[PDB]
Scaffold this active site. Structure first.
Site, PDB file in Angstrom:
ATOM      1  CD  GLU A   1      -3.126  -1.224   1.933  1.00 38.02           C
ATOM      2  OE1 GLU A   1      -3.205  -0.391   2.883  1.00 38.02           O
ATOM      3  OE2 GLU A   1      -4.014  -2.120   1.735  1.00 38.02           O
TER       4      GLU A   1
HETATM    5 CL   LIG Z   1      -1.673   2.019  -2.135  1.00 33.69          CL
END
Ligand SMILES: [Cl-]
Ligand SMILES: [Ca+2]
Ligand SMILES: [Zn+2]
Length: 509
Positions: A180
């Site tokens: 992420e």
């Molecule tokens: Cl991300």
């Protein structure tokens, strides 16, 4: 009565189902076929000493959480990579053929296990070690814990030394470029305070991939592990997207195109698997189907049953901001796969976190089984559910494919054509083993909430089937139990009525 026709042709549309779609991130009560070491805690994990940082999940603490949560024995807490080698040893002991290990790219990893890292100790500081992808000096199996640096290629070398390379039976097959990245500045601001740029993410991805592949040419590189749709589209409004994204429909295309360009310059593939996280935004009954959904809310449960259609079905428009504003990118799997075909052909696709919610409810089990059918049919390479062992119906949905009989019976590995006349009330997926249609496997999902559904099957096959054994779960239990076999098959046709909200696996022979 509700009556649905199912038409199967075992000779048509044959395609391999990747074995690795039935995976998990957590330790589940299910037979899984891939394990991912990933998510927020892995960004700041230091393989030299096993410390890691909670980031925003708990006060920016650096501590021994991954040692404790992974069940590492205390006598191994100071052994390099013991978090990861315990994780892989457990996967191997459970006959899991794919382990995906996250490597660290945000820039720094925990130096210590001493508790909260202040904002004034934002990296670089005494609380962190700087990550370099290439050591550029000889590797050691006893990395130097006293210096200022942690080396990713040296970490991979330790793993390959222990297990063999990714082409060997016990090797770790895949590595992820962190987790992420568009949330680094939110989840891990003490490591990476600035919002990630598209240029930085490509530079790091290319450099880390090169470093890994010099040690293990057979290992697969996964990225970017994007958190959700806004990262797919714009890398979360990345500060350089107005310039870097010129001419690109979305960040997915830029990432594929730039990784292909870098691979073409280098002379080998540097991105093996496009890796995204997909937590459905679908709503029903006034709430999202995951993250705090109320299992009493029948409208939410009904929306959960339909939400897997956003993955594949161009006719389905979910109730969400994505369904409203981002129709040009739905259905999502064909859009991702079309981007791969246009910008980096041959790249695989993985969904490395997802959760349809309702995991302790029949609709979470039916949705899970539907999602796994879709992943197989549409060509996803690897998938790993995110959620714990309390998701008993999600677990049943996995075992319906991986271990339906408790002794290793599994769905076939070659998808075959299988059409339903009503995609709202039902789903059906069919498979064979290899090239052989002697045993035909069918996953049959009745999404009807409060009535049975009668299914009229018509099958074209080189075999004349005479019995269909059946295993199923339903509201009565998430345990998968064997049911009365189907026996009145006339010229490969039969009728089978299934109760409301039931998931079945039929094995015809
Ligand atoms: Cl991300
Ligand atoms: Ca070091
Ligand atoms: Zn469980």
């Amino acid at each position: 009565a509700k009556v649905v026709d199912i038409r199967i042709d075992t000779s048509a549309e044959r395609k391999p189902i990747s074995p690795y779609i039935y995976g998990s991130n957590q330790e589940l009560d299910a037979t899984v076929t891939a394990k991912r070491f990933g998510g927020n805690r892995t960004t700041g994990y230091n393989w030299e000493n096993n410390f890691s940082n909670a980031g925003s999940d708990w006060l920016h603490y650096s501590d021994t959480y991954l040692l404790e949560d992974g069940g590492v024995p205390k006598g191994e807490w100071s052994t390099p990579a013991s978090v990861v080698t315990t994780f892989h040893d457990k996967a191997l002991s459970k006959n899991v053929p794919y382990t995906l290990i996250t490597l660290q790219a945000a820039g720094y990893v925990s130096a210590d296990g001493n508790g909260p890292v202040s904002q004034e100790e934002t990296a670089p500081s005494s609380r962190w070690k700087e990550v370099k992808f290439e050591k550029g000096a000889p590797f050691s199996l006893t990395p130097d814990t006293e210096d200022d640096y942690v080396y990713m290629d040296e970490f991979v070398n330790y793993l390959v030394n222990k297990y063999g390379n990714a082409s060997t039976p016990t090797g770790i097959k895949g590595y992820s470029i962190d987790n992420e990245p568009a949330l680094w500045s939110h989840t891990h601001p003490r490591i990476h305070p600035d919002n990630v740029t598209a240029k930085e993410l490509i530079e790091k991805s290319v450099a880390l991939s090169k470093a890994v592949k010099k040690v293990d040419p057979y290992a697969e590189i996964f990225g970017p592990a994007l958190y959700g749709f806004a990262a797919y589209e714009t890398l979360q409004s990345a500060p350089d997207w107005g310039t870097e994204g010129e001419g690109y429909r979305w960040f997915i295309d830029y990432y594929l195109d730039k990784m292909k360009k870098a691979s073409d310059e280098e002379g080998k593939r540097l991105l093996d698997v496009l890796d995204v996280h997909w937590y459905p935004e679908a709503r029903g009954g006034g709430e999202r189907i995951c993250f705090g959904a109320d299992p009493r809310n029948i409208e939410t449960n009904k929306a959960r049953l339909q939400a897997p259609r956003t993955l594949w079905d161009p006719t389905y428009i979910e109730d969400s901001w994505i369904g409203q504003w981002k129709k040009d990118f739905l259905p999502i799997l064909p859009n991702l796969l079309d981007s791969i075909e246009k910008y980096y052909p041959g790249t695989k696709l993985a969904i490395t976190e997802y959760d349809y919610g309702g995991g302790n409810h029949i609709t979470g089990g039916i949705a899970q089984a539907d999602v796994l059918g879709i992943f197989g049919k549409y060509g996803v390479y690897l998938a790993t559910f995110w959620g714990d062992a309390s998701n008993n119906y999600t677990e049943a949905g996995i075992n319906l494919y991986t271990n339906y009989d408790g002794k290793g019976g599994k769905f076939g590995d070659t998808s075959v054509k299988c059409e339903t006349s009503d995609i709202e009330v039902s789903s059906a997926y069919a498979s064979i083993v290899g090239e052989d249609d002697s045993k035909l496997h069918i996953i049959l999902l009745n999404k009807n909430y409060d009535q049975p559904t009668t299914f009229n099957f018509s099958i074209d096959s080189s075999k004349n089937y005479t019995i269909g054994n059946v295993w199923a779960f339903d509201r009565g239990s998430s345990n998968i139990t064997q049911r009365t076999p189907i026996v009145n098959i006339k010229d490969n046709t039969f009728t089978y009525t299934v109760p409301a909200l039931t998931a079945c696996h039929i094995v015809l022979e």
